[PDB]
Symmetry: C2
Subunit: 254 residues, 2 copies
């Protein structure tokens, strides 16, 4: 029987995490450790300058007060869940986590804190706000898959589910992260005293959203599965950077 | 003359950013947009549910109230600095940003918001707290390098500088991100009422810190330069994941 640490970024009160919890609890042992509020956009932020306080609800759900998604899964794996989880599942997020958006994603960051466990961590996002049932069914299928046979490579799976009835989901695609044009919108709003305050605007239009991208798969009505890692190295740039330094004489006398 | 957006994660009052600002201001036009406090560990977190307020100091430095490093550079590039910057520089951080730590780094996240500009963004971290002068000299050299000849590939450079007098710095190494064993320490501390609160503990020991890693370069007394990107795809896992799904019958009827 699977021991699952269930988290998210929308917080313990989100219908996405509550729907998923109910679904997982009929075949696995589930412990929720999640934020006390909506921490969308929290990325892999974590609390270093202060200790963290936990609040427990009547049903055993743990909220970490002011806790980030990373905080929650870190504490869950390393202190709060005993015996330790076999797997971390983060979701179901209200909204997609696609392309270069993933760098900002609390949903994904929560899953990343489960990267050292025996099973790949799952981040699960719904491309909308209606069909949580569909995302729950997809998640359960993946977990049953993992019970059938272990995944040998890939420590985090980023799963995006079309906001459609399950019957309309076309299948599954293994994808890579797409990307957007640079986001540049800032929305000013005056306070009552006439001071200009600034909202972060919507993202840029899709740029890389073709063959084999997560964007394209979801658009076409497929579940997108993208294996992720935490190595941020642009390996392909190595020789260019090295040659550039030599060319401009930085790091060398000659 | 270079127009530089200067940020960090330690905030506007940090000696690292103040030291660097002074150094850059004698050959470039510099605008500081940085957090109002120490936001170490903020990763690429950004403020979505609220507007952001800016506070300006006597010297023209802009602090974004409760602003994350990502918030600061985003607003700087897209609203607060006119004309727009040619480059983003984030640092000098008090402490290294190496290996898999970079996913949690506010220093690096700030630089990433400059990835769309004409010059590669620089994240600059000191491996200690003494020789900011050394890190400043290294940063200036890189910027002069960029004025000599453009870097054709690599949109973010993660720079780590040994905490040594410049004369003792051995040179420069183009590196890849190393990694650590899983971090698992949690430090409990009782509040005055007898409630257990939890601190995030120190990172795990170095795991991948050999040939060509950022860890190794800094340890040996070299400046480490690692080109980064925002594509989190584990490309090497693609076929394994695809074959696994087929094997366990997830996404396929057969
Ligand atoms: Mg969310
Ligand atoms: Mg030289
Ligand atoms: Mg810092
Ligand atoms: Mg099947």
């Amino acid at each position: 029987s699977m021991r699952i640490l269930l988290s998210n970024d929308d917080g313990v009160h989100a219908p996405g995490i509550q729907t998923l919890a109910k679904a997982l609890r009929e075949f696995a042992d589930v412990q929720v450790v999640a934020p006390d509020r909506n921490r969308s956009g929290a990325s892999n932020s974590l609390t270093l300058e202060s200790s963290l306080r936990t609040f427990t609800f009547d049903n055993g759900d743990i909220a970490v007060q002011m806790g980030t998604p990373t905080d929650c899964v870190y504490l869950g794996v390393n202190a709060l869940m005993r015996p330790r989880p076999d797997i971390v599942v983060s979701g179901i997020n209200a909204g997609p986590n696609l392309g270069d958006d993933v760098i900002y994603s609390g949903t994904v960051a929560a899953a990343m804190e489960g990267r050292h466990l025996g099973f790949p961590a799952l981040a699960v996002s719904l491309n909308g706000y209606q069909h949580y049932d569909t995302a729950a069914a997809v998640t359960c299928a993946l977990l049953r898959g993992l019970s059938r046979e272990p995944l040998r490579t890939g420590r985090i799976l980023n799963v995006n589910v079309p906001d459609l009835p399950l019957a309309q989901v076309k299948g599954i695609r293994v994808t890579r992260c797409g990307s957007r044009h640079p986001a540049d919108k800032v929305i000013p709003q005056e306070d009552p005293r006439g001071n200009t305050l600034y909202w972060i605007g919507p993202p840029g239009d899709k740029y890389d959203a073709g063959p084999d991208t997560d964007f394209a798969a979801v658009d076409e009505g497929y579940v997108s599965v993208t294996p992720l890692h935490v190595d941020l190295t642009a390996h392909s740039a190595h020789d260019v950077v090295s040659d550039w330094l030599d060319s401009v004489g930085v790091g060398t006398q000659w």
